[PDB]
Design an enzyme around this catalytic site. Structure first.
Site, PDB file in Angstrom:
ATOM      1  CG  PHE A 171      30.124  21.300 -48.272  1.00  0.00           C
ATOM      2  CD1 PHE A 171      29.211  21.162 -49.316  1.00  0.00           C
ATOM      3  CD2 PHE A 171      29.706  21.905 -47.091  1.00  0.00           C
ATOM      4  CE1 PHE A 171      27.901  21.622 -49.184  1.00  0.00           C
ATOM      5  CE2 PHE A 171      28.401  22.368 -46.951  1.00  0.00           C
ATOM      6  CZ  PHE A 171      27.497  22.227 -48.000  1.00  0.00           C
ATOM      7  CB  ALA A 172      36.792  22.903 -49.546  1.00  0.00           C
ATOM      8  CE1 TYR A 221      37.847  15.031 -48.579  1.00  0.00           C
ATOM      9  CE2 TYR A 221      39.173  15.284 -46.590  1.00  0.00           C
ATOM     10  CZ  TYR A 221      38.473  14.480 -47.473  1.00  0.00           C
ATOM     11  OH  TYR A 221      38.392  13.126 -47.238  1.00  0.00           O
ATOM     12  CB  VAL A 272      36.019  19.364 -52.816  1.00  0.00           C
ATOM     13  CG1 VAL A 272      36.718  18.721 -51.626  1.00  0.00           C
ATOM     14  CG2 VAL A 272      36.890  20.451 -53.445  1.00  0.00           C
ATOM     15  CG  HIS A 331      28.681   3.730 -55.777  1.00  0.00           C
ATOM     16  ND1 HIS A 331      29.846   3.058 -56.076  1.00  0.00           N
ATOM     17  CD2 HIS A 331      28.858   4.259 -54.544  1.00  0.00           C
ATOM     18  CE1 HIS A 331      30.690   3.173 -55.067  1.00  0.00           C
ATOM     19  NE2 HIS A 331      30.114   3.896 -54.123  1.00  0.00           N
ATOM     20  CD  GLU A 356      26.976   6.347 -51.214  1.00  0.00           C
ATOM     21  OE1 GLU A 356      27.339   5.265 -50.700  1.00  0.00           O
ATOM     22  OE2 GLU A 356      27.671   6.984 -52.031  1.00  0.00           O
TER      23      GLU A 356
END
Ligand SMILES: CC(=O)N[C@@H]1[C@@H](O[C@@H]2O[C@H](CO)[C@H](O)[C@H](O)[C@H]2O[C@@H]2O[C@@H](C)[C@@H](O)[C@@H](O)[C@@H]2O)[C@H](O)[C@@H](CO)O[C@H]1O
Ligand code: UDP
Ligand code: CL
Ligand code: HG
Ligand code: HG
Ligand code: HG
Ligand code: HG
Ligand code: HG
Ligand code: HG
Ligand code: MN
Length: 263
Positions: A60-61, A65, A130, A151, A221
């Site tokens: 996703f941009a 971004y 991204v 993570h 998350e």
């Protein structure tokens, strides 16, 4: 139906000689934890090519971004699933802002302005942030029905330190005596079916929280972690697959830095 592998010459695996002696390479539910040295990429490439596997990569941009797309796509071309069929899906609010990146043969890019389509177009879906760049090989070793990534900040931490949502009022709630790992929302995936099941579950869970006037501490998350706790991933990617060298340096435990954060 899986066709037979061809004759191949490679080092014999040694039963009395562990892959890595410095890290855990298999979870308690027998899911491989992917570290450099645990896999022979030639064998895996053969296995997936014989199935003519197509990998979908979604990013996703939105807003500013879009500026991360050029480096992301260019480095993906050099390190992501090279040799296999790849279909990039770029979700953006600025279609005309997507950079013109040259792709290798068998690779495609679709711009979606902001999916039954995924089911008929790809075999696996990989979902990533991204604002990243590929620095080393990220290939078929990650493919499996469902995978999460450790993570980089909590792979060596105790569960009570994990930043899970700790409020019982939230659907993403996880008590301090529960939890296998802390997965980062920036890199997960699996078969199209499993990824859609996950996104569907998280979407519904987040709507419930919103209705109850609560927002999980780490949003998406937090829910991803709740989902993977209750639905164990069939593979777990080591921090090699999601690192931040500026913030964390380069520990010996990491033989390769494959996918990293862009300052
Ligand atoms: C540097 C940063 O802004 N925060 C670091 C923490 O990283 C964040 O961790 C939370 C969950 O606890 C989320 O996963 C969040 O997305 C993380 O930040 C993102 O990822 C990190 C690795 C950086 O690339 C950061 O720029 C990015 O926004 C980290 O958990 C703690 C402990 O190491 O340190 C914080 O500085
Ligand atoms: O203004 C934004 C903010 C976020 N994102 C998307 O959401 C992802 C996660 O947001 P961000 O990378 O800022 O979170 P972080 O890695 O800092 O925790 C980004 O990588 C993008 O894919 C976006 O497109 N536009
Ligand atoms: Cl994503
Ligand atoms: Hg090994
Ligand atoms: Hg996705
Ligand atoms: Hg995505
Ligand atoms: Hg969820
Ligand atoms: Hg969600
Ligand atoms: Hg999720
Ligand atoms: Mn990010």
């Amino acid at each position: 139906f899986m066709v037979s592998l061809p004759r191949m010459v490679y080092p014999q695996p040694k039963v009395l000689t562990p892959c890595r002696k410095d890290v855990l390479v298999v979870t308690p539910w027998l899911a491989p934890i992917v570290w450099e040295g645990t896999f022979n990429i030639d064998i895996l490439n053969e296995q997936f090519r014989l199935q003519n596997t197509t990998i979908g990569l979604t990013v996703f941009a939105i807003k500013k971004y879009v500026a991360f797309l050029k480096l992301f796509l260019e480095t993906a071309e050099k390190h992501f699933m090279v040799g296999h069929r790849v279909h990039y899906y770029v979700f953006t609010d600025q279609p005309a802002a997507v950079p013109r990146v040259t792709l290798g043969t068998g690779r495609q890019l679709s711009v979606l302005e902001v999916e039954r389509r995924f089911l008929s177009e790809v075999d696996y879906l990989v979902c990533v942030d991204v604002d990243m760049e590929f620095r080393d090989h990220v290939g078929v070793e990650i493919l499996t029905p469902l995978f999460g990534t450790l993570h980089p900040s909590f792979y060596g931490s105790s569960r009570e330190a994990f930043t899970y949502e700790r409020r019982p009022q939230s659907q993403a709630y996880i008590p301090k005596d529960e939890g296998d790992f802390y997965y980062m929302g920036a890199f997960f995936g699996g078969s199209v079916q499993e990824v859609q099941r996950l996104t569907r579950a998280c979407h519904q869970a987040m709507m419930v929280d919103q209705a109850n006037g609560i927002e999980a501490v780490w949003h998406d998350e937090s829910h991803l972690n709740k989902y993977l706790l209750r639905h164990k991933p069939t593979k777990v990617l080591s921090p090699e697959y999601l690192w931040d060298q500026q913030l964390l340096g380069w520990p010996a435990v990491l033989r390769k830095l494959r996918f990293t954060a862009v300052p």
